[PDB]
Design a protein around this ligand. Sequence first.
Ligand SMILES: Nc1nc2c(ncn2[C@@H]2O[C@H](COP(=O)(O)OP(=O)(O)NP(=O)(O)O)[C@@H](O)[C@H]2O)c(=O)[nH]1
Ligand SMILES: C1CNCCNCCNCCN1
Ligand SMILES: [Mg+2]
Ligand SMILES: [Zn+2]
Length: 166
Amino acid sequence: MTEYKLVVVGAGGVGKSALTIQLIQNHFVDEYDPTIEDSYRKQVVIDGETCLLDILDTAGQEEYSAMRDQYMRTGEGFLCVFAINNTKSFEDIHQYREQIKRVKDSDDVPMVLVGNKCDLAARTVESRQAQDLARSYGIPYIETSAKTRQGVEDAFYTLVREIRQH
Ligand SMILES: Nc1nc2c(ncn2[C@@H]2O[C@H](COP(=O)(O)OP(=O)(O)NP(=O)(O)O)[C@@H](O)[C@H]2O)c(=O)[nH]1
Ligand SMILES: C1CNCCNCCNCCN1
Ligand SMILES: [Mg+2]
Ligand SMILES: [Zn+2]
């Protein structure tokens, strides 16, 4: 069975753990819920393929940046997750994509840009400029809401498709 090693990157609080738990466990978490599992596994069906998903859930804080260089190196695809209500997290996508190309030694790693927290009305990152940042990266863009399950599978499965196409 094909195993897709996925790594969730992005600034702190954008919903990296929420997107991961909503995919593997079908349950939404907030600040009060534990998010220290880091490593996840689940058998899913993507485009008719029954496969195994290895989700490497990383922390977004700069304290764990040196810890992100060690793991995620063994990752194949990456979800560059930001929050549509936080403009800094969207422009922080710059330093995370650049941190993956330096661990991968490659300009085109299987990658995906994720705009999370779409349920909230206080959008500060218009989808237009997010679709353009992902287009300039040459990677797909997925708008998600880990709170309402919308786009959650679309983000992880499209990144898996990115791995296949690479
Ligand atoms: N409304 C809404 N809130 C969300 C969504 N995803 C995450 N959140 C909220 O954002 C906060 C951070 O969630 P979390 O998944 O831990 O984000 P994180 O990027 O993993 N943080 P860290 O980098 O420290 O691991 C929580 O309060 C959570 O409820 C979403 O899609 N919608
Ligand atoms: C709350 C949940 N923590 C996830 C892992 N991060 C360690 C530091 N985070 C600060 C608040 N983040
Ligand atoms: Mg987290
Ligand atoms: Zn945290």
